[PDB]
Each structure stands twice: as C-alpha cells, then as structure tokens.
Design a binder for this molecule. Structure first.
Ligand SMILES: [Ca+2]
Ligand SMILES: [Ca+2]
Ligand SMILES: [Ca+2]
Ligand SMILES: [Ca+2]
Lengths: 387, 387, 387, 387
C-alpha cells in the first residue's frame, strides 16, 4: 500500500558511513561501467545505487570522450548497494541522459529523458513498463533532478526545467500518481532559476534544495505539499554559501534573491532544513569541486545571519568531489526518518587531463544521534595506473 | 490463465525509445556474445532480449567466420532488457540456428531448428522441456520467423518455410497448444513466397508481415484467426515499398502480386496495419541495409495508391541497420495494446571488411499517442578499436 | 513428496539435440573453469550441467597439469543448462575428485569423495548440508559413478568401488534415504569388475550399465530393485561391443563373462535396455575415444547374437569424445520417461599435446518417437588459438 | 522465530572437508577480490563465506600495498560457499576494517568498524539497515572478533577491545537484541588481554576462545551466559600451547595466568571445549603461521597437565596458514551441533616478498563421529605465475 510521510527527521548529531563502492579502484581491472550523476534510492526491501551509464567500460576504448553529457549510449542503471556498477550486474531502468526515480510504496516510478537538445522527451516508466510521455515545452534541454523523487499516498511530484541555463527558463512541478499525470504547475515563489533538485519528505511535506545556475551562490528551495498539490520557492537565508563556484561567506545573506558573485555555474547539492536540526553540505573549495563537508547551521532557511555551530568533513580538500543529493529509507524501522546523503567523487576529465574519460564513485552517509568520530572517504583510485 | 487478445492497438502518433543494449560498444572490452537475428519478447512479468548466439565472444578468436548463419555452435539465448548479451547473464532457450518464442499466458514456448540443410528438425520446447519434434518436409533449410509468435487462449500458430529461397517453397502454419500440435495447413492466398514473419495480434486476430525472398519488393501479409485456425495471405497494396533491396517507390503498387525489380533477396521487416493508424518500417537505402524509418501510410494494406502522411527516422542513412520485427507487451496495463518494434544494427562483415566477425546490437521502440521529438539511435561502436 | 518411478520408457525412434555448452570455444576468451567428468541432472523445476572443476580457468596458468585426476583443488560444481561452467555462475556442491548426485523428489543428495589414494572418504550431503561420512574399505581409491544416481520413494542407491583397477576390487551398493544409510551390500551376480555406473530407472526398477576396467570389452549391468533393496549383475550379451579400447565386433558375444582382447582400460558409457527398444552408445573408434554413435540392437542384454537395426552418429570419428552417461527428467510431463544422455568432448592432453591442460565441453541429447534427421555435434574449439 | 541453543556438541572423532574456494588459484586469471580475515556464517537456509575486501582485485594494480589492515577501501563482503570472492558475485554487508556477523533466527546482524585509529566507530546493522552506533571508548583502534557471533532467543553478545595491543586495554561484552543495545559490561575474570574471539554456543551457553596479544602463549576463554547476560574469563590450562608465535609445550601450564615466552603477538585461533570431547587447533610452526593441526586434548580447559590423545593435520608445515575460527550450522538437522571451523591461508606479503599484495583463500572443515582418513588442504596457488 502507498507510503505515507508520517514521521519526522531524527536528530542528527553526526554522520556514519552508509555505503561506498570503490568503482574506479575496482574498475582498473574489472568490467565496471563509466557513469556519472549517481544517487541512491530505497525500495521497501532494499536500497540501491543509481547512475547514468555512458555505455562503455572505464578501460574500454570507447571511454575516450565521456566528458560528454548527452548521447545515445547513456542509460539509467542501478545495482546492489556498495558494489561497483558492472556490466554483468547492472539493471537498466530506462534510456536517457537525465533521470529521477522513486518507489511509491506499491512499486517504483523511473523517468528518463532523451533527445536532441531541441526536441527532447520524457518517458515515465512505472512498474518497469512505459506509461506516459512528455515533450520539450521550451525546447532547450528538458532536464530533471538527477536524484530520487519522493512520494506520499501515491502522489510523487517531479521538478523539470526546460530552457536556458544562463538565464530565465521554464520550470514545472508535475504531480504523478501511478505513473500518470495528475496536474502540473509553473514554478512559483521568489527563486530565480532552478536545476537538479535534491528532495526529501517528512510529516507530509516535501523539501527540495535545488541549484540556481545563472546567479545564485545561495541555494533555492522548493517546498512541496503532496496533498494540496501546491508549492513555493525561496532561498536559504544563511550566509554560509553552499554552491560552487562561489564567493566567500559574508556575515549576512539573501532570503529572497540570489547572492551575486559568480554567474552561470553551480553543482548539485542538498540540505536538511529542520529548525536547529539543520545541516548543509558543501564543497570545501569555493573555486573547484574539491572536498566536502557538512555544517550545522541552525535556522539556515529563515535566519539570514546564521553561522555554523558544528561540522563534519566528509572528503578532504585535496580530494575531488562533485554532485550530492539526499535520500532516506522511508521503510526503515524506527520512530523517525534517518537522514542520508551521497557524494559523487568525479575522476578524470576535466581536472585530470592525462586520461581521456570521466567517471566517478560513490560515498554515502546517514545520520546518527550519537557523536561519532570522523574519517575522510576519498575515491582512492590512483590515476597513474590508467596510463 | 491463457492470454486473450481482447484489446486493440493504441493510437500511434509517434515512437519513444524503449530499449537499447549498446552491445558492440560494450563488447570491445567485456565478455559479450557474438549474436544475430535478435528480437524482444514479453512474459507476464518481464520483457527480454533474444538472439542466436554464435557460441563465441566478439573479441574471442573464434569470432572469425561468424558471417555464417547455420552451425553447431549457435543457440537461442535471452537476457535482461537493455543489457548486452554476455556470457555470464545469458539464458539458453534451445539449440539451433533458427527460432521463435512466445509466452501463452501460462508459460513460454520456444522453438529451435538445427540440422544439416537437407536433414533439419524443429524441437518445440514448452515450459523449458522439449515436447514435440518436426522434420524437414521439403528438405531444404527448414526455417521460422526469427521473432516472437503470438498466442490467444492457449493457441499459438507459427509459420515455417521449407524449400528454395529463390523459387517456390513449402510454407506451413502450425497451430500449437501446450507445445503440442493441434493442426497445420499449407500456405493459402495470393502471396508467392514467405520468409521470416513478423507478427502481432489484436482483437483476436493475428497479423504477420513477412518477406518474399524471390520476387516481391512489396511485403506479403498473412492474417491468422486463432479461434477458427484458418488464414489467408496477400500483399501490402501501397507503393511505399518496404523491402531491401528494392526499386524506387512507384505511384501505384500491387495488392495480389509481387512488385518486380529485384530478385532473390530481402530483409526481415514488419508493419502495423490498422486503418488510418498504419505504420510501416523500412531501411532508408534501397540498395543497402542502411538507415531506418517509420512511415504513416493510411490504409496501406488495401489502398494501392497510399503515400506517407507522417514519419519518423529511427536510424540515419549513414548508419547500418538490418532485421526488424514487431512485439507488444500483452500484459501491460491500459485499454489498448501499445505497438513496439526493434531494429537489428549489424556490424562487421560483409560491409565492414576490416574485421572478421559479424555482430549486432538492438534498439527497440514503442508507440506514443503524443507527438514526441525524434532522435536517431545508431549502434555507436567504433570499428577501429577492434583493429 | 518423494518421486516414484511409475512410468516406462518412451519409444526412441531417434535423438534430438537437448543441450550444448561450447565451453572450450567460449573459454578461449571468458572466465570458464577447467573441468572433466561432466553429467546432467534434473531437479523438479530445472535441469543442470555438472562437473568436477580443477580449480582454475582454461587460460589461467594453473591449468598446466590438469591432465591429473585427483587433487585438493577439484570440486563438484553445477551450472545452468547449456551455459559454460564459469567462475561467476557456478555453484559448488561439495569438495572432491569423484561424485554423484540426484534429487529424490523432496530435495537433492550429492556425494563427493576426497582423500589420498589410501585414506579417502565420502561425504554425503543432503539439502546442501553434510550428513553422512564413509571411509575407504579397501583403501585403494574409493570412487563412484561420475554421473547421477536415481531414487524411488526416497531410496537412492549408489555404487562405489574400492580397490584395484586392473584386478579384483570391492564394490558396494549403498541404499540412502534422506542422506542416511539404510543398508549396503557387496556386488553380486556374474560381473567381474565394476566402475563408473550409468543408471536410469523405470517402472520401479533401476538399471546401471557400468565399466569393467580390467577385462571386459562388453559392459556389465547392475539391475537394482529399490523396494526390496537387492540387486544382480550380468554382461550385455550382444556382440556389438561398446567399451574402448576394444577389439572388433564378433558374430557372437558373452552374457556372463568378460569378452577378452583388451586389458586394464575402458571409458564411461551407458545404454537403455528395453526389449526391442534398446539403444547402445559407443565411440566409433576401437582404439581411441573418437566419435560417438547410438545403435538400435534389439534384445542386446539377453540375445547373444544381436546386431544393429538402426543407428545415429552423434560425433564424427574425426572428433574427440570421451565419457558418457544417462539421465532422464523424471518430473517432465507425459505418460513415459523420455531417455536422455550426454557425451563429454575432451580437449587437450593427452591426444592434443601442444597445450598443457585437459578440459571438455558437453553435448546432450534426448529421444524422439519421430524419425529426425541427424547432425554431428563436435566441440568446435580451435586448438591453435590457445597457442 | 529466534534460534535457541538447545542441543549439545556431537562427538568429534575426526574432521571432514566442508568448504574450499581456491581463490588465489582462480584469481590469477579472474576478477577475484583481495581480502583477508575471512570466516563462515550460516543463515537458516544457507551458509556463506565472509571477509574484509581491500577494494581491489588481486591482479589489479591497486593491490600493491594491501599488506595494510585499516583503510577507506575495505568492506565486509560475503559470497556463496566455496566460490571465490569475486567482483560480480560478492554482497557488501557494511563498510569497515573490522567486523562480526550472526543470524539470530529471524534475521542477520552485521557489525563494521571504520575510522582513524583514534576516532573509530561501530555501526550495527540489522536486517540490512543501520540501527546503532558506538564510538571509541579508549580511542585506540576499536576492534571486534573477525568471525561470527552467536545468538540465543534474540540476544547476541559481541566482544570488542579498545586500547593498546601490547598492554592493558579495555574490553567490553555488549549484548544486542534486534540490533539494539541491551547492556554491556567490562571484561571480568582472570584473562589479561583479549583480542579476536572465536565463539560457539551449545546448551544455552556461549564459549569464546580469544587471543591475548601481549603476554599469553596459552589462550584466554570467555564463557558467556546469554540468559543472565553475565560472563567470566580464564585461560586454557593445558600445556599444549596454541598461539603463534609461542615457545615449546611444557609438561605443565597456566589456568589463570598467561604462559610467558613471547610478547606482543599472536594469531586468531579457536577451540571446542567439551569434556573429553575437546579439540584444539594450532599452527604446527611455533615461529611462523605455518601448517595447521587439530589435537584431541581431553579436559584441556581445566586439566593443567593434559596432552594429546588424537590428532589431525589440516595443512602441512610447509604450507602457509593464518587466522582460524569457529562456526556451526545451528539450523542443521540432527540431535546435536556439528562443530566446524575454517583456516585462512595467507599468500603474499610478508613471507612472500616477490609480490606486492597480501591475500588468502579459505579451507573449512566440520566434525564427523566417524574416523575419516586425512588429507592436507593447501592454498595451491603458484606464486610464480604472478610475476
Ligand atoms: Ca549558482
Ligand atoms: Ca524481396
Ligand atoms: Ca574394459
Ligand atoms: Ca600471545
């Protein structure tokens, strides 16, 4: 029967290692697939890794050129937790270069976009069969979250953007039930530009922290109500800026406007916005996708002067990071939802020029109410063995 | 309980990418099997890829010579949708160099032919055990559809041809129930020569678009009634000729005779013949198996002057195609049958001489009532990496 | 519930290809295990391939020396029908260099022997746990059938030999129920020496055709009654001699004595002994394990002048064969038991010196009441690609 | 429903080969993972192999350096019995460089420790989700058993040590029920230092034979009562010393004190302590982890002069051994618990310098009431093929 967001977030006093696949390490001498834009997603019975294959192995010759995002040979694949995405164990969800996926309690919905930049289309799959199709409205790179959606009593909303990446675009929230469209609505609120939303849900409310690609160093937030099927957007108020690249943290920041300083760029990220129980993730570098850390900034969403009270380094500044996004095991035992996240560890091009490919591996963490010691969790591949 | 063709075809206003395995790309550095003559086929619970293995990997040395059709080391294998047919994940159905396969609702029937050209035999398997055997009647290359059959309340007919390929031959429609022969009957109607039939069924009627190898540039059609166990054949009337090689489209074409101009050659193909809701597939080239496209030609079967009103390019003329065939997920949700098809993308010999093998990959599409933008879906392997 | 041999043998008017794995072909560029002494065995729900691994891949370096039979790194593995025995898909049954295995209807019993030649022991496994252990009685290479046993209402007898191979030895029939020993009894009847028995059962009777290694060119037969738990032995009377090596067929042969002419050698083989419905298998060569054929010799067991009335060549004399043995799918649909068999196709040492290993692949056939044309089914590997 | 230790140990009159994976042999030309610290563990339905991956294949280049114990790329993986731990078949349990795992009857609990040496933490997983977290108390390499725990009516105790390895440390027995902490208690009794406990349970009592790393050549024993949740410790009295390195066996030994002679070193080991039905395992070498043997020393725990009455060599002194530990199939049929154990066969560094890695394979044995002949069970890899 349909899942229903009835619990709230547990208290996050630190983070524990949840998953880690060591793909590029293992892929130096194994049949692992070149992938990117990963995420994690739970069924009622198991949690899995997810990514867009590039349709080639890392050591395969057809890996030259996989710095490229959109092509005919990309796909949404998933595999067992903490395994590497191999040729022999990966399951294909749908064909496309942009995706999102979520179980509703009864079964799983998966969405893939393919197409030329000016004539793309989404095919919504539900219970492993195609059900609904949508075409470019703005006709400039139709695209979704690149991480899991969230459902509540059968309704699962998904944010798409179609249009420019360095300007005004058209974003829609679609509300699906059983893979079928219930309704959709243009973006509302004060957010200026929306990309790659990272979502979670608790107490019958869904929160997505997204990416303003053309203006904002602070991150927009869509809050969604899955029962009334309406929404609104804003920016995180805090001065602890969490996009990349970004300027340095000011002492005061914006609540309803992009904080300026870098244009036309960002990375996928997330946060858990929960009163004083609020944690933001970010690359440590402001210039580069390097390092990763979590920061406890009470009332970040609302308090425009808020600054960190506690923190945890996940990846050292010397180590390459990348995209990141939220997920929770909604069918786990317990009185509250335990917050989890993942970081994509990009390897290869552009920063690592001596190779001709671009891949990644995954580290995943979840919260603890304990205060656990911290380690750092690098990819751990040695680029020189690929030469 | 037995499946019953009770729905009709949905409205096809365009086609969406359904499946794609990228085998030859992935097989440059993975243990993928050399195969050909693929197809797709659905059980009640999952849809799979199917093909005739050549009993060797692509990079394996025993791949030299796999331009050859009939040998002791060929087999019908199936694998998970959109995976590549690998050594470690493929399931063997039966041993043979010609096949067809279909689930009847209760369980699956698979048919393989093996033998020397003059002493071949079919073994009908049902629920993974061998049940019934048939011997060459004409004693010249007993052969079947090379794509899935169709059932209705337990009866699943299959078209075989035995005899010459460049002349009069003996074709039979066998009607199986539970893997056992109910009846068979010689070919009837006006079709002159029958090979490799592509079949679908709706509203308790089965339509196969086949291949006249010795005369026809227009395609013969067998219509089958699974309740009365009778049939009849014809040719598609339209002048939009859909075999290969073929002459150019005239302004008027044949309904009960082969349209002349090329002898003793063709390729497997298909169509969905549904009033104005009619779509034909073809190679774009008339000379070569190059490119692929779908064309909307209302009343093609009956209207001998019919010409296209809408179209979709699937594979660009610069890209190699090959066989193609129909399938539908008869156990999918919905009020109508959503039409699907697949194209075999041949690589290697004969057209690509620098390698000593011949393999292929698969693209598969299904219909949408939407009007989706179009992309082209090439194999995407780079023949030079095999050198 | 326990299986009960209640049907009789179908009429065998010819043989159809049942299974074929092409392992050595595929193993030239895949991770396939060096094996030997294969067989086939059916559960209620699926039929599988079985063999003794040598604990190395064919292309692996540790394959030098696998001409050797008994070592610490051998095991009974099984795998899906017609796949090759690969590292990633094979299931280990037990550890040993001699084996037999059979499902009793409720679950499967598997028996492996390991040890030094003078201190060997059998461990009987039942439902994948070890249950019963037996030690060398004669203390000279304890050994079993190397093909599947047969059960009836829970009782499954197994023939072991312990002792000399070129002389008098001690053979016992053990009767197991639920993996536990019910009873055992020394060999009886007129057979002089027993090795590697190939067994089948019909109408509550079990027939094993075995191998007299020190004297007989004609094959001994143990007939077993699974209800009374007694047995008796004999030789096949016919002059169509079916061991190897062997002299030429005389016009008259022995019923209760070894036919003389070659000493201290043989190969595993089988027959189906059923009135006029009797078929014997043999290598075509008398000198070498070359070629394979089936022969219809009515009343072979009893009629000491019987000579062939029909035949089928399975492997041409120019192609290497090896061991062979019987099996039937006792849970198949139908009024009679359809007779099946397999041939081991040995490759490498001794006959093929340029390589340093010894492996094999499998062809398997079952009967038809039809008269099917015949093909020949060689291994099909090309020894020169291993150089 | 929860498992309940209600049977007692069967009579062990000898040992039979239970499992053997030949990983390093097979890993010379297959995608097998570098691992160490293995063990075996049974679910209600199957028994599996377990080990800490090093996140690389043996032939992979990232295997240089895997002599190292604690890193970010290690994990607890399990795989099917007697298979090798491959990239494509291994299941990841949790992320860490120290572990233990046991099914309680209802489902399985797995515990992994990760961290820097001074800020480590345990995450207790239960039914494949994380549930409970514990932090370093002594802040010097938090560590567990490196072999399976044991449960009784839902309570499963686990021994951890935190502190120095060559001195006084802090050891705790935690008692888990449903993955949650019931209670814990500091170490008690006369044992001086505790590491890597090997545990079994019979008649509602749990016995762990552990390792005193700084003083004892004789092995400490924790006996645990899972109903009262208390414990006590001691040393095995016997003079047949079973650590390594160790001095030579005296004629008399300690019951409540470490027997002196080697400092600050040992290996994981085990024993089954059962009146006269008592068997100890040990390396044959006193200097080196070489060879392995079992010894029957009646009343070893209590009788401080006890010396062997029977024995079995498992691995010859010329062959490398390593860790060892106990397990039993608590859900096996029968009136008593059949005692099993495993030996880790280390290959590579330190003793085998010409390679740059360190891996192992597994041999596993269980008891028989029979008196079975003995074989020796070496790794069987040939280090020269890795050069
Ligand atoms: Ca930005
Ligand atoms: Ca033609
Ligand atoms: Ca003989
Ligand atoms: Ca010690």
């Amino acid at each position: 029967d349909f899942n229903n967001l009835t619990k709230g977030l547990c208290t996050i006093n630190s983070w524990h290692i949840y998953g880690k696949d060591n793909a590029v390490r293992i892929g130096e001498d194994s049949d692992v697939l070149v992938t990117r834009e990963p995420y994690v997603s739970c069924d009622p019975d198991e949690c899995r890794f997810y990514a867009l294959s590039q349709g080639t192995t890392i050591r395969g010759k057809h890996s030259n050129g996989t710095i490229h995002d959109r092509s005919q040979y990309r796909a949404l694949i998933s595999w067992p937790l903490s395994s590497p995405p191999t040729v022999y164990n990966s399951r294909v969800e749908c064909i496309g270069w942009s995706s999102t996926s979520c179980h509703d309690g009864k079964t799983r919905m998966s969405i893939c976009i393919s197409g030329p930049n000016n004539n793309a289309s989404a095919v919504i799959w539900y219970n492993r069969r195609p059900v609904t199709e949508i075409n470019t409205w703005a006709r400039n790179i139709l695209r979704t979250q690149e991480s899991e959606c969230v459902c509540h009593n059968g309704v699962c909303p998904v944010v798409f953007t179609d249009g420019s990446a360095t300007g005004p675009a058209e974003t829609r929230i679609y509300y699906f039930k059983e893979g079928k469209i219930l309704k959709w609505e243009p973006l509302a609120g004060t957010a200026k530009h929306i990309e790659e939303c990272s979502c979670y849900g608790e107490r019958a409310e869904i929160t997505c922290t997204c990416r303003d690609n053309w203006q904002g160093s602070n991150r927009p937030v869509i809050r969604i109500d899955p029962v009334a099927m309406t929404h609104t957007s804003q920016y995180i108020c805090s001065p602890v800026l969490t996009d990349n690249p970004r300027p340095n943290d000011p002492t005061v920041g914006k609540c309803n406007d992009p904080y300026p300083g870098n244009n036309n760029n960002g990375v996928k990220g997330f946060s858990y916005l929960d009163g004083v129980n609020t944690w933001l993730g970010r690359t440590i570098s402001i210039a580069s996708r390097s390092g990763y850390e979590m920061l406890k900034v009470p009332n970040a969403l609302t308090d425009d002067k808020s600054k960190p009270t506690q923190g945890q380094t996940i990846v050292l500044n010397t180590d390459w990071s990348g995209y990141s996004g939220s997920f929770m095991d909604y069918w786990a035992e317990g009185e509250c939802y335990r917050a989890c996240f993942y970081v994509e560890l990009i390897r290869g091009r552009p920063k690592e020029d001596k190779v001709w490919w671009t891949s990644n591996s995954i580290v995943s963490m979840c919260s603890s109410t304990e205060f656990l010691g911290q380690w750092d969790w690098p990819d751990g591949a040695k680029i020189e063995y690929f030469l």
